[PDB]
Amino acid sequence: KWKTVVAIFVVVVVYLVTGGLVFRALEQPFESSQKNTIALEKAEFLRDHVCVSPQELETLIQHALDADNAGVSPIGNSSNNSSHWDLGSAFFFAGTVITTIGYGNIAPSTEGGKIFCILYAIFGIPLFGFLLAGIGDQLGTIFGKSIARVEKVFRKKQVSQTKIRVISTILFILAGCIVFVTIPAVIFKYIEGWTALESIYFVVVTLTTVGFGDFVAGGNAGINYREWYKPLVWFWILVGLAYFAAVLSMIGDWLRVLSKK
């Protein structure tokens, strides 16, 4: 019904205003802190290095940013050996577009690169949708057979179909939270050398297809990653996304029969 659609809309607008106030309270003090630190460090550099003019400083900072925007770190000369568009990294970038994660640590700079990216997303995102619905249907049948087995057991125990379906879904959600969320975060903690939080934050930001790109697997210039690392990460992204898609498909299929009745 539309009456409940407007109800969902009010809850969402309230949730965004709430979220907004919480994010402000948590991040604005640090944002205002870094605002002051940069202003101090720049004014400090100019007073410590008299031979540098304020405009000469601005020109360099601009050059540093211009390079960083293109995906080239303006730190060190030895870093000019590792590419972001090599077959391997270009494969993982292509997959980043197709999964709608769109990390953002690297993006097309060329006009043609942007043109191709528009067309690559337009046809590629539905192509992945088919693969995800493919694995989603296969896993959904396995979920359906598993729930049917539990349904026959708890039917004798005098338990409602909705109560069985709800508890089963929580269990499937928890199963994926260990296998595809907890276990890989622990692996990223040791491999990438991130904190316990940064690792879980990365996995959540990844598997939700939010993809901030403030944390990317196989992104460190310092860490000497193995050849199988980046393909294993995208493979985990594929199995992980398909698992939570198969659970979401299962919930959606039940709600469609609920709307019909």
- With binding defined as CB under 6 A, does residue 119 bind ligand 40D? no
Q: Which of 90, 125, 174, 197 binds ligand 40D (CB under 6 A)?
A: 125
- Options 53-61, 69-77, 150-158, 202-210: segment touching ligand 40D (CB under 6 A): 202-210
CA geometry: angle 257, 242, 201, nearest 5 deg: 110
Residues flagged as binding site for K(+): 100-103, 209-212
Q: How far is the CB of 126 from ligand 40D (least distance, A)?
A: 5
- With binding defined as CB under 8 A, does residue 178 bind its own copies? no
Q: How far is the CB of 213 from K ion (least distance, A)?
A: 6
E strands present in 144-231: none
Specify whether the CB–CB gap between 225 and 158 falls below 8 A.
no
Residues in the chain: 261
Closest to ligand 40D by CB, 52 vs 125, is 125
Between CA 202 and CA 191 the distance in angstroms is 13
- With binding defined as CB under 5 A, does residue 209 bind K ion? yes
Specify whether the CB–CB gap between 71 and 84 falls below 8 A.
yes
- With binding defined as CB under 6 A, does residue 171 bind ligand 40D? no
Closest to its own copies by CB, 47 vs 157, is 47
Which of 242, 194, 185 lies closest to 219 in space, CA to CA?
A: 194
How many Cβ atoms from other residues are within 10 Å of residue 76's Cβ? 8
Q: Which of 171, 204, 223, 251 binds ligand 40D (CB under 6 A)?
A: 204
Calculate the alpha carbon distances from 126 to 100, 121, 133, 208 in Å.
10, 8, 10, 17
- With binding defined as CB under 6 A, does residue 26 bind ligand 40D? no
Which residues in this chain contact ligand 40D in the complex, by CB under 6 A? 122, 125-126, 177, 181, 204, 207-208, 244
